[PDB]
Amino acid sequence: LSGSLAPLNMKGLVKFQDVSFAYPNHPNVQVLQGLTFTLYPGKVTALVGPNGSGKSTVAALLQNLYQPTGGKVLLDGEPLVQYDHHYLHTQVAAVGQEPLLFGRSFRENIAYGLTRTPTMEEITAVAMESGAHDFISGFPQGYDTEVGETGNQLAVGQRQAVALARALIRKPRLLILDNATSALDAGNQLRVQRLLYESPEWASRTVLLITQQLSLAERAHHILFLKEGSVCEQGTHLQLMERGGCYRSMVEAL
Numbered sequence: 001l002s003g004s005l006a007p008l009n010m011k012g013l014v015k016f017q018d019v020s021f022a023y024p025n026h027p028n029v030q031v032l033q034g035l036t037f038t039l040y041p042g043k044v045t046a047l048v049g050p051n052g053s054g055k056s057t058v059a060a061l062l063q064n065l066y067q068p069t070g071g072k073v074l075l076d077g078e079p080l081v082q083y084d085h086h087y088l089h090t091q092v093a094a095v096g097q098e099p100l101l102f103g104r105s106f107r108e109n110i111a112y113g114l115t116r117t118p119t120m121e122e123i124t125a126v127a128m129e130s131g132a133h134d135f136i137s138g139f140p141q142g143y144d145t146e147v148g149e150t151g152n153q154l155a156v157g158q159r160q161a162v163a164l165a166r167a168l169i170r171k172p173r174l175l176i177l178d179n180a181t182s183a184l185d186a187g188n189q190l191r192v193q194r195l196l197y198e199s200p201e202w203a204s205r206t207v208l209l210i211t212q213q214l215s216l217a218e219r220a221h222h223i224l225f226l227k228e229g230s231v232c233e234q235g236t237h238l239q240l241m242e243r244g245g246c247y248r249s250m251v252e253a254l
């Protein structure tokens with residue numbers, strides 16, 4: 001039954017199983033095909049690949065915005081469609097390369113999707129992890145300032161830093177980062193991934209790091225190289241450099 005599941009215990013074991021996909025406005029153009037992998041909790045899994053390989057598409061399918069045209073997208077061995085949409089939203093947090101923040105305050109941006117009301121100490125905490133706290137404080141009303149009443153247009157890094165704070169404060173089981181730290185400062189890029197890798201609270205949570213930046217991908221527990229809508233190969237940084245294929249060619253080229 002659709003939208004019937006909302007378990008007390010959520011592990012966060014994501015699996016794509018022989019997943020194929022095409023957008024419904026272009027069904028005769030294959031984007032994904034034979035896509036199979038498992039994202040384990042307690043691991044930061046990197047998803048790297050060239051332009052048009054279908055990384056953002058995989059992120060869209062994992063958020064349950066689209067159904068796969070073939071195969072299955074499983075969460076704890078159960079199709080995403082069977083999970084309640086709000087429950088899924090409370091357990092899974094997704095952050096894009098260009099996050100939409102307009103129409104609310106910075107507080108409301110960070111406290112987005114939460115049932116409970118977080119304290120300032122909670123809000124500042126997650127904002128300082130993403131490097132959002134200092135420039136937000138620079139605005140007239142701080143976190144209470146509306147997006148658009150800041151004085152000037154926010155940079156892509158600044159929007160990402162806020163959208164990352166939203167993801168962190170929710171305490172999700174599945175964290176999806178679709179180039180979510182691309183415009184961020186080089187230090188803040190690694191500070192965020194250090195938290196996700198080293199901290200004990202994320203040691204029981206699943207993290208999907210989609211990125212084309214090699215310095216980010218090499219620090220993941222596990223790397224998935226996407227090519228032609230499917231996984232070319234996978235393993236650790238040093239494992240892929242051992243034999244030589246899709247990943248090694250990219251490292252040597254760049």
Ligand SMILES: Nc1ncnc2c1ncn2[C@@H]1O[C@H](COP(=O)(O)OP(=O)(O)OP(=O)(O)O)[C@@H](O)[C@H]1O
Nearest residue numbers: 023025026031049050051052053054055056057058
């Ligand atoms: N809404 C859409 N409608 C139709 N086609 C789309 C849509 N979104 C993406 N595509 C197409 O699907 C393919 C995969 O797109 P996707 O953005 O997932 O690749 P990507 O690896 O994320 O690329 P990049 O890393 O450059 O963003 C592309 O060829 C793109 O043109």
